């Protein structure tokens, strides 16, 4: 048997998966396209109408699933949406990450862009989780992308409203959604909390900041989280830790907006990381040693530099830097100056110094972030003071 | 009377416009959306099938019109596509540009991105013109965008094919499409030619490089073009001239690809223009005065600098530059060094010098491009020598 309800066609044997309250998702056809066909019981008709409306408003963004058509009969309602290759859950559960490069982080970036688009339309998702972040089928050039789906529980905030009244999948629910200690009503940042748990789930390849599945939601309410898959002496893990712990903060007002998340160093290219180092080096160049900028930059600076940073770089660099200026080994500012100096004059340096540094910009900046895993995170926090100036708008969100 | 053919609905009184060979475009409805409904006579059924197929392949890009559904009856075929607010023709014919800022150039950028997407799918449009570049209706944040439409005459090149055999709207047709002197078959660059004529049509607010409409196509075949709406001593017009004359070159092999067009200074922000000046200044710093780079950079450099560039800047800058280095007034390289110098030390300079320059980066770079209208175009051409190096990949297409 093969079902045809209006312009939507599918065969009941092609079941892709199941949702809540009797929802089934089939592989099907619409307008000679392969599509996913979502079948909703009459008890959930008000959720399908909500989903259809909110998909019409937001599916123009590439990281929101495309919506095609809807139709009803006597029995059910049918929603035709973009057919996808996998969920993020099975991507994390099945794909070998060793040879995927930055693709996992790109999926998180695309998820966040789709979330930012929803929030810019005053839509809160409220049920974000790996099960409904979808991985597209490859396009004509083999590229895949993440898409947000499943809009049955979304809330459309009225014009002039920033909060909603008080719904999700246990284990991924922001605490202010379930605790009665609700000073403020929940807002867009409930999606930031869930996203933060998703971020950790992807980069840890399967763990959750609030533990194993049976205890997860109870740990969220207690604030008991652990990010120990992130090693504290690895640059990439330090950066990810800094972002994720803000995304999952118990206080919703301390969580960054989606657009704020998108500006974080977690997503910067290596080229952009080096440009941030150069730009901060120039900003603090003629700065006062007693000023608030260099004060913030040097507070806790001893551990960032490893007591004396000149003792923690390769000898060919160490012999080269003694000649011209001779820098201060306990200053983070002086570490940044040496980096800036060696990048600007990179092609004047002898072949021995260009060898241990590597090429500009990627290898060069990794020479430093590998050996000073806290440098970028520390510098990024200190220079929040300059987040409003023009030079630093590529790096901070206003 | 109100027509309903399948899931497409429209009323024959809501005519938006007409196309070739009896095609009519109506305002209509599909799935409770407002849509454009394209009605095609049986004589053009093979073109509607071509359009439906190629829209299915390419409408995912934001600057290709979105396709919704198609249906037939006894009489006609109907295509439901995104409803748009205007054509580029009426935009140019009716909108006051004085208060639109960079919006016209952004429309050209978006058109080119849609074209690049088609070409990346081995689709040549072959009938690009202001009449079928559409202006979207504003989104929820008031923003508009350009979209390519009308795919009835598109060619899908077979896998492994780069040319097609030998169709358009008179006045916008690349010469190799009509002249029998066809050494090479037409390729994607027929769309570049048309686009180049569209570029000039927008920035001149209604003119065409090959003249008035009755003589246009005859001038194309003769190679007789004129871009004299572009003043030769205005930076923005110099840059646009440089691009447009390559886009409309008679020799198709001299026209840049769509992705090449997208990298041209015509589309650079002011910030990016200044960064190009700084990056070239650093690249030629320790360069040999006899080398090929500085040779190319100085060839024809006297007119770029206006005999002596130190005599063509404001006196407060002139008094400031004499102090430290004292530069050479006939060298383009030295002009670039002074610029680079004053940007790097911008906050060390006295208030008089920061005043006549303006703020970084926008006013600062305009101080120089306003007074040396050929500087950027000249520097961009000379430094094509370095187009392959890593530092200059933001500026040239490989
Ligand atoms: O709103 C929606 C939209 C979609 C959806 N829309 N296009 C899709 N293409 C493929 C799949 C899919 C699958 F079903 C199982 C394994 C791999 C797959 F790729 C799902 C798709 N699916 C759900 N559900 C609820 C949450 C469940 O975890 C999954 C099904 N809800
Ligand atoms: O393939 C296509 C798709 C569309 C099309 N698709 N959505 C549209 N929304 C609005 C308009 C539109 C109009 F019709 C007249 C004035 C202002 C407008 F905005 C046209 C639209 N139109 C044509 N034609 C052929 C070339 C003609 O110059 C125009 C009509 N061809």
Would you say the CB of residue A383 lies under 6 angstroms from ligand 1? no
The structure was resolved experimentally with: X-ray
Pull the structure tokens for residue B314: 């404001």
Quickly count: other Cβ atoms within 10 Å of residue B398's Cβ. 9
B230: closest CA of chain A, how far (Å): 33
Q: For ligand 2, say whether the CB of B86 is within 6 Å of any of its atoms.
A: yes
Q: Is A111 in the pocket of ligand 1 (CB under 6 A)?
A: no
Residues of B in contact with A347 (CB under 8 A): 286
Coil, helix or strand for B366?
helix
Rounded to a whole number, what is the distance in Å from the CA of A114 to chain B's nearest CA? 15
Q: Backbone dihedral region of A211: left (phi > 0), alpha (psi from -120 to 50 degrees) or beta?
A: left
Given the DSSP bridges, would you call strands B24-30 and B67-72 parallel, antiparallel or unpaired?
A: unpaired
> Which region, left, alpha or beta, applies to residue B133 given φ > 0 means left and ψ of -120 to 50 means alpha?
beta
Strands B155-156 and B123-124: antiparallel
**C-alpha dist (Å) from residue A47 to A43, A76, A214, B140:** 9, 13, 28, 23
What is the crossing angle of helices A270-283 and A362-371, to 10°? 70
For A88, A157, A245, B347, the CA distances from B271, given in Å and listed in that order, are 38, 37, 34, 17
Distance CA B58, CA B55 (A): 5
CA B380, CA B374: separation in Å to the nearest integer?
10
C-alpha A72/C-alpha A179 separation (Å) is 38
Q: Which residues of B touch A259 (CB under 8 A)?
A: none
The residue among B7, B29, B31, B362 with the most chain A CBs within 10 A of its CB, best to mutate, is B31
Report the chain A residue with the minimal C-alpha distance to residue B30: A69
Measure in Å the smallest separation between the Cα of B224 and chain A Cα atoms.
40
Q: What is the DSSP string of B131-164?
A: GGEEEEPP-TTS---EEE---TT-EEPPTT----
The residue among B29, B60, B348, B394 with the most chain A CBs within 10 A of its CB, best to mutate, is B60
* Best residue for ligand 1 mutational test, from A8, A14, A16, A81 (most atoms within 8 Å of Cβ): A16
Q: Which strand (E) or helix (H) includes residue A3?
A: strand A3-5
For residue B7, list chain A residues with Cβ-Cβ distance below 8 A: 6-7, 69
Strand partners, B276: none
Residue nearest to atom 19 of ligand 2 (CA): B86
- Would you call B240 exposed, middle or buried from its count of C-beta atoms within 10 A (0-12, 13-18, 19+)? buried
d(CA A39, CA A241): 40
Q: Tokens for B395, please give them.
A: 């500026």
Residues 6 or more apart whose Cβ sits within 8 Å of residue A4? none
Question: 12-51 in A: which are within 8 Å (CB) of B?
Answer: 31, 33
Buried b (16+ CB within 10 A) or exposed e, A122-149: bbbbbbbbbbbbbbbeeeeeeebbbbbb
Say how far apart CA A321 and CA B123 lie, in whole Å.
55
Work out which ligand 1 atom sits closest to the CA atom of A19: 25
Is residue B228 among the annotated active site residues? no
The reply to whether ligand 1 has any atom less than 6 angstroms from the CB of A27 is no
Strand A33-40 relative to strand A77-82, pairing: antiparallel
Give the number of the atom of ligand 2 that is nearest the alpha carbon of residue B35: 7
Q: Residue A145 carries which DSSP code? A: -
């Amino acid at each position: 048997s093969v079902v045809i309800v209006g312009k939507i066609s599918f065969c009941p044997k092609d079941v892709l998966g199941h949702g809540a309250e009797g929802t089934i998702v089939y592989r099907g056809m619409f307008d000679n396209r392969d599509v996913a066909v979502k079948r909703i019981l009459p008890e959930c008709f008000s959720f399908a109408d909500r989903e259809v409306q909110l998909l019409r408003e937001s599916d123009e963004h590439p990281n929101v699933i495309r919506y095609f058509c809807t139709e009803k009969d006597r029995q059910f309602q049918y929603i035709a949406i973009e057919l996808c290759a996998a969920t993020l859950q099975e991507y994390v559960e099945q794909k070998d990450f060793a040879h995927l490069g930055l693709e996992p982080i790109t999926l998180l970036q695309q998820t966040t862009s789709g979330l930012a688009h929803l929030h810019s339309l005053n839509i809160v998702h409220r049920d974000l989780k790996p099960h409904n972040i979808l991985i597209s089928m490859p396009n004509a050039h083999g590229k895949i992308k993440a898409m947000i789906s499943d809009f049955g529980l979304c809330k459309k905030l009225a014009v002039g409203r920033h909060s909603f009244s008080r719904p999700g999948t246990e284990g991924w629910i922001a605490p202010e959604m379930l605790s009665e200690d609700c000073k403020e009503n929940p807002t867009y940042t409930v999606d930031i909390f869930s996203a933060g748990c998703v971020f950790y789930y992807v980069i840890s390849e399967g763990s959750h900041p609030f533990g194993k599945s049976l205890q997860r939601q109870a740990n969220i309410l207690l604030g008991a989280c652990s990010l120990d898959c992130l090693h504290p002496e690895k640059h990439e893990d330090v950066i990810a830790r800094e972002l994720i712990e803000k995304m999952i903060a118990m206080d919703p007002q301390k969580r960054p907006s989606a657009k704020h998340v998108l500006k974080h160093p977690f997503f910067w290219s290596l080229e952009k990381q080096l440009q941030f180092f150069q730009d901060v080096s120039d900003r603090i160049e003629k700065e006062s040693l007693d000023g608030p900028i260099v004060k913030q930059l040097e507070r806790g600076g001893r551990a960032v530099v490893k007591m004396d940073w000149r003792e923690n770089i390769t000898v060919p660099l160490q012999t080269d830097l003694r000649k011209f200026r001779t820098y201060k080994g306990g200053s983070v500012r002086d570490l940044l100056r040496a980096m800036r100096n060696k990048k600007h004059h990179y092609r004047e340096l002898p072949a021995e110094v260009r060898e241990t540094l590597g090429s500009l910009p990627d290898d060069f900046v990794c020479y430093f972030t590998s050996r000073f895993p806290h440098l970028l995170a520390h510098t990024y926090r200190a220079m929040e003071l300059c987040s409003h100036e023009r030079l630093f708008q590529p790096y901070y969100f206003h």
